[PDB]
Design a protein around this ligand. Structure first.
Ligand SMILES: Nc1nc2c(ncn2[C@@H]2O[C@H](COP(=O)(O)OP(=O)(O)O)[C@@H](OP(=O)(O)OP(=O)(O)O)[C@H]2O)c(=O)[nH]1
Ligand SMILES: [Mg+2]
Ligand SMILES: [Mg+2]
Ligand SMILES: [Mg+2]
Ligand SMILES: [Zn+2]
Lengths: 95, 13, 1119, 170, 169, 226, 57, 112
């Protein structure tokens, strides 16, 4: 199947949170390049084309790899509204 | 209550 | 080759001319050969002699007395196949002599006025309408006559219905009221019956309870004897049920009608009803209803017995029948003739109406010839039929067989009650009277089951229209050839016996004889028999009769067979099957698939193009070999000669094969070496695998002609062109084109390539606020013409064979309004077999080519011969179509026996003879394996062990003759083509015959990324280069709800359908590599509100705290 | 309880009732659009007649004809529908017929919408396949995924720009 | 009595046709032609004409006509849009623009604004810009060369970095 | 195979399931006791009547000559119990054993059909559906709404306690329970934006616009149509 | 599950677009996560035909 | 920018009707066999419902996009995105009121 599908189920109380988590996470993960990635150089996803291993364009597949290391944190409340719509832009170039 | 409906013609006449 | 014929049930007569129903009806529906002046009525003549003499003349000032004289037709404007190219309805001009008579006596002869000209039937069965080939499906209905029915509206006694068939005629029902009287349904306007009985010229004390002698509770009769006196006042005292009232001075207004006057009958001069009403009620006719010439009131021979038999039925058991509407004695077929005849009856029901009109509107002395008789009401009336009638349709011509099944079709739909009322389980059920009248096993699958239906092989339609099957009469156990065509009803009067009674010449050699007694089968003694079944065949349609071992095939899966042979599509190595039923030759002839010789002679010329032959009488007639012609369905009809120069030849001998005939033999598919067994999932659920080797032999290749059109229309923005000069960026991509618009006859075309270039004016004069700045830089000619060039639709075209450039239609081709010219192109393609191609056999095996292996992999016989097709066996117990195995065995024989066979439908090969044929075949195959110096393989040892354990072969017998046993079972020993090891256990190989089912473009491979969008609703729409999206029906919507696929659902409901704004927003994001945005409101909802809006209901969308929210962001808000 | 009675009749925006030209200088329009015209001539002819101060009898007949009219627009069929004079006897699809999809439209409704990244084909079994995959025509995919593909074409040297990348494919 | 209003004599032209058609339907036996009618209608009538007076005469078709299936599909269902830009178009007709403010953005506000008065503000200016002194500038034999200062400036940055080449087709 | 000749034949297959879901007096309506008690069977040669008697009352059911007897003279028949073979009408058994009895009857004679064609499907699913079948109540003791009025049972969270308790003071509400088939239980939604869809809209909207009915989009449907 | 065989049953394919849709699709529509059945509890992707015929033997 | 959670449906006060409208349709005219333009104060009058073509008016005096919303002197036709034709409500005024039929024939006859 998909990587550690069972383990990634356990991380959340409900099926759907992990879907909301993953997608939302991926959104940021492929908004700010892949500059936000709490996942090290050597543990990044890769392809095989042209005879050359190049990082996987599949945002959705990254966030899953990411959360699987527990490096993220999730909840119903963590930050305010447009008050996050500036923080991630400055720490990771929002251009 | 249906005896006649299309009276507009007959009604006038 | 050797074709061993089988069976012994000596058929005393071959199947009649097959398209009979279609050709012969029309012959007598027109009558234009031996007919001199006055000759017969049945057909069109009747439609004339009914509306004539039209009369509207009063003894006062003038009027109309117009009488019928003659009719004729001739010169068809354009030759047969010319109509096809020029999109003209092939037909003839119908004249008619009339002449008008004067009130002061005068006869100015109106001669031949052809104000109305009618279509002609082709020689083969069909018609040509607007180029296209069509068929007129004959139809079933409840016959005309009087019938007696039980009541579901009162669990008890009976209703009496008199039923005629005029095109406006009256229904006469005779029931007994819930209040113990006698209801009489004339319309829906019910009334107490007795009333009319007095007007019949019969009182209440001459024959009343005399013929109502069994009238013991006859208290629907009792009420008013103090009413029954004079018929002059009784005829008045009926006009009560008539609105909005009328003075009864000319009381004989509706009275005159129901006597003789042509409209209350079921047939002219009695008959039809009278036919049944010979034993239903009285005996004879009053004329054709309750007819009276010149007397006080009206003579009745019909209304009187109608009660008095309902009486006799409500009496113990005299006469005493309760009717069956499913019974074919009560069901008639309305043929092409009739269906069209009573359509010429409706035409002259308006021509005559126009004649009466010109008496006030027209003069009485000025219009002497015909200034009132018009073609227009006859002209449209027939074309609203042939073109627009449900009962008329596109001619099936996937192959010759399909083209013949279509003329032999029967529908209940059209003018007779259809689907919305269904009458399911009834009607749709195969009836006890269908024996040899309809195929019990041919019908469409799904919704239209039992509704559409196909006529049994030997079936015949008699002069009246009742289906007859033939029976040979037998007397004293001595069977005679004297064969009778009994009706449905005649049949119920006898004890007929089945076709397979053991005989001894003339003589029956059987103790117990197995026979139908009006449906019920009973084992009887010879002495009791009277008639015998002609052929096992006579019980089934033709498509059914082409399936060997039918008896071993379950009806369900054999239905599928009957059906799929319709989807046979001529292979270019069309083979007739290895095991045949008999009807193979006879179909190809009766279909006009092949070209036969019409007399004895010597052949003069033979080329692909044509044949000239010199017949014994001195005639040198040329037969064109109609070449690479396009069918309705694409499949190439065209002949191919099977005769050499100066070859002496007999009459009816083959000159040119069909498109699907292999020497006069119906050649629908191809014979192939099939191993039946599972192969690595590659045939998982009806899936099928294919030896590459089938493709190299061009085995399932097929030639398909596809026709495109392009219009050159006049426009409000200025005429558009068919110019070679399309404005774009290429010229290297105009090569094959050059031809002044069109593409050169011969060129390859892939998708995207241009068939016909076209330039159209589009944009509304001005250049775009952006492109005005743009085109300037390049050199702003910015020509006001667009690339509307006819392009190759995606997913294959082929190579060009013929183009047709028709400008202005000045040769005699009818133009299209506001359309300058039209170009056609025709693209041919040979279509080999391919993963996806579907495959079928006559026993109902249908599967898709799921893998084409190379021959290096295929299972092979010991002599190295590998197999062609691998058929999983799990698609068989559950089906219960064993004929496919009785076919695979016999095949294994004839293969090595170098033969082909003729098993007939219920006669045919038996299990002994086949093992015995396999016995001789074991020589050819193995009895010469050692004369080459080879014994048995080290792997046959390995198998035979496991074989004898399976209990297949005898332990003890010799390793050689163990195999012979094993071969007589059908299984041989295969070697897995990969390893070279054997398949544990034997596998039944053998020849089986298989057909490549035909491609529909609905079930063409489709794909949309994005394209057009409906104007109104703004939901995705189809182009020609563009394929629309998939309907996302309620059912699929639930699918995802269930799934908690939230976003996904919504984006199927907005982003990808009606969200005008967001779909654009989406696209961009995807292009830029941005993530798709969330979406606006779908026109679904917006348009919804607006509809409610329109209906004066305020529809607000409130926010959290109930403050209107703007779904039409800006736009609709005022100020 | 007076707002149930109508005195200002709203009118559906024109676009969702269009008057488009089709083939051979012939047009196509809605029944709604012909239901309104017949209404107006009657309200308009009433203004004349009332202005004129005509006898009440006729001032009436026109109002009868105006009720009959607004009826047949709001909900045509609740009194014996009117049709497109000659042509045929087809009743005119009124705002009521339209909403409740009266004529096989509510049966068409549940046949769903249509979707813009879709496709269809025949199915051939795929044994070699693993449980979470399918055999798909690349041919198919390149329609379906087109816009996603055009970018990668721009990201790679396969195109200078998207229009050229799209051009590369038509 | 028509969904499209028509002049009163235009009705009588068709009401003459309607009368005229019936005679030629019987006088010729067959259906007469466009040539056949003019030579019978009146002195000043054309063959090409009738065709227009007949296109004009029609019903026309009802969007609410059902199509073959009879149950679900109506006539209007199959009529596409072409007025609105499609997801491909709209995006193009906004990438062309967002490149123009990325093409003549590094241009003079008169090498751009002249073409934004000629073409960037919609009015032809064929014989409208040379007369009016255009607020502050110079006219006469020089404006017919100011679009050589402006229109011919756009050629090079288009032929070198080939941005705008493909937006033609 | 080998049965029908002129007698009462029970419904079977999809008809029966629709018969049980919309129910609906069945084909062979079985007689059931209004009350608890003991059996006494008096009869003429043709007439037959069953007597259910618990101390005070005497209940008499005169079962037709055709009827088949499911009960023995002098047995105990718990109220709601069938006295003839056949099929219970749920409404009758609603009026005699209330909700839970009708429900576990419903669920069952339903599951009975399926499983007999070897379809193994989880009781809860049928349950859920019957539950909505039972969704509505019909006010008997009014509080500020007219007598009858059928409406959703659980609007009675606060609006049944409001008589002395929450919103404080006034008359307490009482309500009859209601069995209505899946069809009828759908036309009675809160959601007019749903109820519009189901059998005839005309009337749904009339009534929705009069009242000024707000559509809380709560169901999945309302959110989809929008 | 699909109830499809190969006498020419056709399927339709859709693309889920938004990075959320694919999220949904993979975590909760992928044919290798929906093994058991919503009606029974029982598995609904089981050895079927040839697969049994093989294993039994 | 406030999101939606409820859907009300109530009766239409003519004032409210007349609120949504953008101009009385006074003429029974539609379109012109000549110009193919809609008729003045007719069912398709661009004056009322919105311009036919994007960013323009009827007569053609105001063009381009900058002036996003500028009624014209000769016609009055607002120069804003043509799509506004598929939404913008119009109305007809009535010389006498006539009862809406649902509240008349649907039983219980909501007025009866
Ligand atoms: N769950 C489910 N089952 C269906 C469905 N459609 C058909 N079936 C089952 O599949 C089996 C055979 O289906 P068919 O495809 O008609 O059989 P056929 O190959 O002989 O035509 C039948 O039971 P069977 O022979 O007992 O099945 P099996 O033992 O062959 O698996 C039938 O009940 C469906 O939509 N859902
Ligand atoms: Mg193609
Ligand atoms: Mg199956
Ligand atoms: Mg199938
Ligand atoms: Zn203007």
């Amino acid at each position: 199947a998909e990587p550690g599908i069972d383990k990634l189920f356990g991380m959340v109380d409900s099926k759907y949170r992990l879907t909301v988590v993953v997608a939302k996470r991926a959104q940021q993960l492929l908004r700010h390049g892949f500059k936000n990635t709490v996942l090290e150089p050597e543990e990044r996803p890769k392809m095989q084309t042209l005879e050359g291993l190049f990082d996987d364009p599949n945002a959705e597949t990254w966030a899953m790899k990411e959360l699987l290391t527990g490096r993220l944190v999730f909840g119903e409340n963590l930050v305010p509204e447009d008050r996050l719509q500036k923080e991630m832009e400055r720490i990771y170039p929002g251009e | 209550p249906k005896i006649s409906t299309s009276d507009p013609v007959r009604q006038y006449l | 080759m050797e074709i061993k014929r089988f069976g012994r049930i000596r058929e005393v007569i071959p199947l009649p001319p097959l398209t009979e129903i279609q050709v012969e009806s029309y012959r007598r529906a027109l009558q234009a050969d031996v007919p001199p002046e006055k000759r017969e009525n049945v057909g069109i003549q009747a439609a004339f002699r009914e509306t004539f003499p039209i009369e509207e003349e009063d003894k006062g000032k003038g009027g109309l007395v117009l009488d019928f004289l003659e009719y004729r037709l001739g010169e068809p404007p354009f030759p047969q196949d010319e109509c096809r190219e020029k999109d003209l309805t092939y037909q003839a001009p119908l004249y008619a002599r009339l002449q008008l008579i004067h009130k002061d006596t005068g006869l100015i002869k109106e001669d031949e006025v052809f104000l109305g000209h009618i279509p002609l039937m082709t020689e083969d069965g069909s018609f040509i309408i607007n180029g296209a080939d069509r068929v007129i499906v004959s139809q079933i209905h409840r016959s005309p006559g009087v019938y007696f029915t039980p009541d579901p509206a009162r669990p008890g006694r009976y209703i009496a219905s008199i039923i005629p068939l005029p095109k406006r005629g009256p229904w006469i029902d005779l029931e007994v009221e819930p209040n113990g009287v006698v209801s009489m349904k004339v319309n829906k306007r019910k009334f107490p019956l007795v009333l009319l009985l007095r007007v019949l010229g019969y009182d209440q004390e001459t024959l009343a309870r005399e013929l109502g002698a069994y009238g013991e509770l006859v208290q629907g009769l009792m009420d008013e004897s103090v009413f029954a006196m004079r018929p002059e006042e009784a005829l008045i005292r009926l006009f009560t049920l008539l609105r909005p009232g009328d003075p009864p001075k000319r009381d004989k207004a509706v009275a005159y009608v129901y006597g003789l006057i042509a409209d209350p009958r079921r047939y002219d001069l009695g008959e039809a009803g009278r036919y049944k009403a010979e034993e239903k009620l009285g005996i004879r006719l009053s004329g054709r209803t309750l007819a009276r010439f010149e007397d006080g009131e009206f003579k009745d021979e019909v209304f009187l017995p109608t009660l008095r038999y309902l009486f006799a039925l409500t009496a113990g058991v005299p006469g005493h029948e309760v009717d069956d509407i499913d019974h074919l004695g009560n069901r008639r077929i309305r043929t092409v003739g009739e269906l069209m005849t009573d359509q010429f009856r409706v035409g002259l029901a308006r021509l005559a109406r126009g004649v009466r009109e010109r008496m006030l509107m027209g003069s009485e002395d000025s219009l002497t010839p015909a200034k009132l008789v018009n073609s227009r009401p006859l002209e449209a009336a027939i074309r609203e039929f042939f073109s627009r009638s449900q009962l008329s349709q596109f001619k099936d011509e996937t192959n010759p067989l399909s083209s013949l099944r279509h003329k032999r079709r029967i529908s209940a739909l059209g003018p007779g009650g259809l689907t919305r009322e269904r009458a399911g389980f009834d009607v749709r059920d195969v009836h006890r009277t269908h024996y040899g009248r309809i195929c019990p096993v041919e019908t469409p699958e799904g919704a239209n089951i039992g509704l559409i239906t196909s006529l049994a092989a030997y079936a015949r339609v008699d002069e009246l229209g009742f289906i007859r099957t033939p029976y040979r009469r037998v007397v004293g156990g001595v069977v005679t050839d004297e064969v009778v065509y009994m009706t449905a009803t005649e049949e119920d009067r006898y004890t007929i016996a089945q076709a397979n009674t053991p005989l001894e010449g003339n003589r029956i050699a059987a103790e117990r004889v197995v026979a139908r007694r009006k449906g019920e089968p009973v084992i009887v003694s010879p002495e009791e028999v009277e008639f015998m079944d002609v052929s096992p065949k006579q019980v089934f349609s033709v498509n059914t009769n082409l399936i060997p071992f039918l008896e071993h095939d379950d009806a369900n899966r054999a239905l599928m067979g009957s059906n799929m042979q319709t989807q046979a599509v001529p292979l270019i190595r069309a083979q007739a099957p290895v095991v045949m039923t008999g009807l193979e030759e006879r179909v190809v002839r009766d279909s006009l698939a092949a070209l036969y010789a019409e007399e004895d002679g010597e052949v003069a010329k033979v080329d692909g193009n044509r044949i000239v032959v010199r017949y014994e009488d001195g005639r040198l007639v040329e037969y064109p070999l109609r070449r690479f012609y396009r069918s309705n369905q694409g499949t190439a009809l065209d002949q191919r000669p099977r005769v050499v120069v100066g070859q002496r030849v007999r009459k009816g001998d083959l000159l040119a094969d069909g498109p699907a005939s292999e020497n006069g033999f119906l050649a629908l598919g191809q014979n192939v070496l099939v191993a039946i067994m599972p192969f690595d999932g590659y045939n998982f659920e009806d899936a099928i695998v294919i030896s590459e080797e089938l493709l190299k032999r061009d085995f399932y290749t097929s030639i398909h002609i596809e026709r495109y059109e392009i219009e050159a229309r006049d426009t409000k923005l200025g005429p558009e062109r068919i110019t070679r000069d399309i404005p774009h960026l290429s010229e290297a991509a105009l090569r094959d084109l050059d031809e002044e618009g069109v593409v050169r006859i011969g060129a390859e075309v892939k998708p995207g390539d241009i068939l016909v270039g076209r330039t159209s004016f589009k944009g509304e004069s001005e250049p775009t606020p952006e492109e005005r700045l743009l085109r300037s830089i390049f050199g702003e000619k910015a020509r006001d013409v667009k690339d509307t060039s006819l392009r190759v639709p995606p997913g294959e075209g082929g190579i060009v064979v013929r183009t047709v450039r028709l400008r202005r239609g000045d040769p005699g081709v009818e133009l299209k309004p506001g359309v300058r010219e039209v170009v056609r192109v025709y693209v041919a393609q040979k279509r080999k077999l391919q993963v996806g191609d579907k495959l079928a056999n006559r026993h109902g095996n249908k599967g898709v080519v799921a893998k084409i292996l190379p021959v290096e992999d295929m299972p092979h016989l010991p002599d190295g011969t590998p197999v062609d097709v691998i058929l999983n066996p799990l698609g068989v117990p559950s089906r219960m179509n064993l004929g496919q195995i009785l076919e695979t065995h016999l095949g294994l024989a004839g293969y090595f026996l170098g033969q082909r066979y003729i098993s007939p439908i219920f006669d045919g090969a038996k299990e002994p003879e086949i093992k015995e044929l396999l016995a001789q075949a074991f020589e050819v195959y193995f009895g010469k394996r050692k004369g080459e110096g080879f014994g048995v393989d080290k792997r046959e040892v390995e198998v035979l062990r496991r074989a004898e354990k399976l209990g297949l072969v005898t332990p003890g017998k010799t390793p050689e003759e163990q195999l012979k046993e094993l071969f007589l079972q059908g299984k041989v020993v295969l070697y897995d083509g990969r390893t070279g090891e054997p398949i544990e256990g034997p596998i039944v190989v053998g020849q089986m015959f298989i057909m490549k089912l035909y491609h529909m473009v609905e079930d063409k491979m489709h794909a949309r990324s994005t394209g057009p969008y409906s104007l109104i609703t703004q939901q995705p729409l189809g182009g020609k280069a563009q394929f629309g999206g998939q309907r996302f029906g309620e059912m699929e919507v639930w699918a995802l709800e269930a799934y908690g696929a939230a976003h996904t659902l919504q984006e199927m409901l907005t982003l990808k359908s009606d969200d005008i704004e967001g779909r654009n927003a989406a696209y961009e994001a995807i292009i830029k590599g941005e993530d798709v945005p969330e979406p606006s409101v779908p026109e679904s909802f917006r348009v919804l509100v607006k509809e409610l809006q329109a209906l004066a209901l305020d529809v607000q969308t409130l926010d959290e705290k109930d403050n209107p929210v703007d779904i039409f962001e800006g736009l609709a808000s005022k100020r | 309880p007076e707002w149930m009675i109508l005195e200002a009749v709203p009118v559906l925006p024109p676009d969702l009732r269009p008057m488009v030209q089709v083939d051979g200088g012939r047009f196509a329009t809605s029944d709604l659009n012909d239901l309104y015209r017949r209404l107006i001539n009657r309200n308009n002819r009433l203004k004349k007649l009332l202005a004129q101060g005509a006898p009440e009898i006729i001032i009436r007949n026109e109002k009868r004809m105006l009720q009959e009219a607004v009826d047949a627009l709001l909900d045509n069929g609740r009194r014996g529908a009117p049709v497109t004079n000659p042509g045929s006897d087809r009743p005119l699809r009124s705002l009521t017929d339209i909403l409740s999809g009266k004529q096989g439209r509510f049966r068409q409704n549940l046949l769903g919408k249509r979707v813009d990244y879709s496709g269809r084909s025949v199915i051939v079994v795929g044994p070699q396949l693993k449980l979470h995959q399918c055999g798909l025509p690349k041919r198919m995919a390149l329609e379906l995924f087109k816009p996603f593909l055009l970018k990668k074409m721009e990201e790679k040297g396969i195109a200078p720009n998207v229009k050229a990348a799209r051009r590369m494919l038509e | 009595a028509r969904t499209i209003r028509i002049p009163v004599h235009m009705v009588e032209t068709i009401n003459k046709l309607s009368r005229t058609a019936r005679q030629l339907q019987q006088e010729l036996g067959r259906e007469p032609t466009y040539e056949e009618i003019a030579e019978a209608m009146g002195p000043g009538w054309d063959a090409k004409r009738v065709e227009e007076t007949l296109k004009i005469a029609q019903e026309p078709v009802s969007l609410e006509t059902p199509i073959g299936d009879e149950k679900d599909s109506f006539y209007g269902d199959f009529i596409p849009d072409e007025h609105l830009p499609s997801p491909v178009d709209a995006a193009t007709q906004s990438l062309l623009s967002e490149e123009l403010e990325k093409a003549l953005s590094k241009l003079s506000e008169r090498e751009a604004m002249v073409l934004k008065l000629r073409k960037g503000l919609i009015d032809g200016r064929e014989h409208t810009l040379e007369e009016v002194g255009a607020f502050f500038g110079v006219t006469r034999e020089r404006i017919r060369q100011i679009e050589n200062k402006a229109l011919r400036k756009l050629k090079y940055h288009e032929s070198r970095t080939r941005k705008l080449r493909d937006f033609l087709d | 195979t080998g049965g029908v000749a002129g007698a009462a034949d029970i419904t079977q297959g999809l008809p029966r399931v629709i018969e049980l879901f919309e129910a609906r007096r069945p084909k062979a309506k079985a007689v059931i006791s209004e009350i608890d008690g003991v059996v006494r069977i008096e009869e003429t040669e043709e007439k037959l009547s069953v007597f259910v008697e618990s101390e005070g009352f005497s209940k008499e059911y005169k079962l037709p000559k055709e009827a088949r007897l499911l009960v023995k003279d002098g047995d105990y028949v718990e109220a709601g119990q069938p006295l003839t073979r056949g099929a219970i009408d749920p409404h009758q058994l609603l009026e005699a054993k209330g909700p839970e009895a009708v429900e576990r009857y419903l669920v069952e004679e339903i599951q009975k059909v399926y499983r007999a064609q070897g379809v193994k499907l989880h009781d809860k699913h049928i349950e859920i559906v019957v539950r909505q079948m039972m969704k509505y109540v019909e006010v008997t003791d009014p509080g500020d709404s007219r007598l009858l009025e059928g409406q959703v049972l659980e609007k009675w969270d606060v609006e049944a306690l409001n008589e002395r308790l929450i919103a404080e003071g006034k008359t307490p509400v009482a309500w009859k329970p209601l069995l209505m088939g899946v069809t009828k239980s759908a036309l009675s939604t809160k959601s007019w934006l749903s109820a519009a869809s189901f059998q005839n809209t005309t009337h749904v909207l009339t009534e929705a616009a009069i009242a000024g009915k707000k559509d809380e989009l709560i169901g999945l449907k309302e959110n989809v149509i929008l | 599950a699909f109830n499809a065989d190969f006498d020419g049953d056709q399927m339709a394919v859709h693309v889920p677009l938004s990075s959320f849709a694919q999220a949904e699709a993979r975590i909760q529509m992928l044919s290798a996560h929906n093994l058991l059945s919503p009606a029974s509890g029982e598995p609904l992707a089981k050895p079927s035909r040839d697969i049994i015929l093989g294993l039994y033997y | 920018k406030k999101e939606v959670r409820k859907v009300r449906i109530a009766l239409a006060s003519p004032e409210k009707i007349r609120s949504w409208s953008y101009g009385e349709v006074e003429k029974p005219e539609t379109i012109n066999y000549r110009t193919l333009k809609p008729e003045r104060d007719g069912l398709f009058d661009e004056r009322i419902f919105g311009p036919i073509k994007d960013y323009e008016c009827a007569c053609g005096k105001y063009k381009r996009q900058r002036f996003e919303g500028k009624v014209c002197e000769r016609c009055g036709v607002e120069v804003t995105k043509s799509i506004v034709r598929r939404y913008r409500m119009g109305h007809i005024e009535l010389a006498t009121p006539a009862a809406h039929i649902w509240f008349v024939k649907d039983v219980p006859s909501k007025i009866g």
